UniProtKB/Swiss-Prot annotation, chains A, B:
Organism lineage string: Viruses, Riboviria, Pararnavirae, Artverviricota, Revtraviricetes
Residues in Peptidase A2 domain copies: 20-89
Region (Dimerization of protease): 1-5, 49-55, 88-99
Organism per entry: Human immunodeficiency virus type 1 group M subtype B (isolate BH10) (HIV-1)
Protein name: Protease
Full-protein interval shown: 501 to 599 of 1447
Complex formation: Homodimer, whose active site consists of two apposed aspartic acid residues.
Function: Aspartyl protease that mediates proteolytic cleavages of Gag and Gag-Pol polyproteins during or shortly after the release of the virion from the plasma membrane. Cleavages take place as an ordered, step-wise cascade to yield mature proteins. This process is called maturation. Displays maximal activity during the budding process just prior to particle release from the cell. Also cleaves Nef and Vif, probably concomitantly with viral structural proteins on maturation of virus particles. Hydrolyzes host EIF4GI and PABP1 in order to shut off the capped cellular mRNA translation.
Active site: D25
Length: 99, 99
């Protein structure tokens, strides 16, 4: 679908079998999801943003559905104020910025 | 144009008579530009992101050119690690997300 930006670009995602709402973020290299239990092996990582760095748990090759489109890649789980879908998964579903 | 997300979506912007590179961020509600001596009246504000909040100076009715497209709105100036063009300005150049 073509998404305008008058409102935050929020979409429904399915992760670990459960439904969540996330923000399509072109300014995020990675995908960061709020703290949750996810079946899998993880490794600690640190990511940075506008206010600084946060510790996250890195999960590889996770199957996630973003607005009905399937993607399989890295998902970081930690104390983010909001769930964000970064470029790593957006490229998988073929998202582009147009104007 | 159509911008793919393999790399960070950076564009050239013109502000206060200066040319710089900025990141098109659909996950940013506001526009944040690196510290610069802009003339005019401003008001203190604190903006947050991943990691926390930073103090910025809010300037209204700022004329900016994003990739050859003129826009006008609020611009926050502060110690940001990178210039960020948010939704407030992206909606003015008719930018959309498509997948
Ligand atoms: C796996 C670890 C290695 C990789 C790791 N990578 C990074 O750290 C890379 C550079 N970081 C990023 O790409 C991060 C997102 C996290 C991530 O993708 O990892 N991007 C970001 O954090 C980008 C800005 C940015 C871009 C590049 C560099 C620096 C900063 N901001 C994303 C962010 C999303 C928002 C929904 C929380 N937006 C904002 O921070 C904007 N804020 C807003 O729009 C607020 N008004 C909303 C706040 C919500 N309200 C509330 N809490 N009451 C701000 C720019 C005006 C590293 N380098 O350590």
């Amino acid at each position: 679908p073509q998404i305008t930006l008058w409102k935050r670009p929020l979409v429904t995602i399915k992760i670990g079998g459960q439904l969540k709402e996330a923000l399509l973020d072109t300014g995020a290299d990675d995908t960061v999801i709020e703290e949750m239990s996810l079946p899998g092996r993880w490794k600690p990582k640190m990511i940075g943003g506008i206010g600084g760095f946060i510790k996250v748990r890195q999960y590889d090759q996770i199957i996630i559905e973003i607005a009905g489109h399937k993607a399989i890649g890295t998902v970081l789980v930690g104390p983010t104020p909001v769930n964000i879908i970064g470029r790593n998964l957006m490229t998988q579903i073929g998202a582009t910025l147009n104007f």
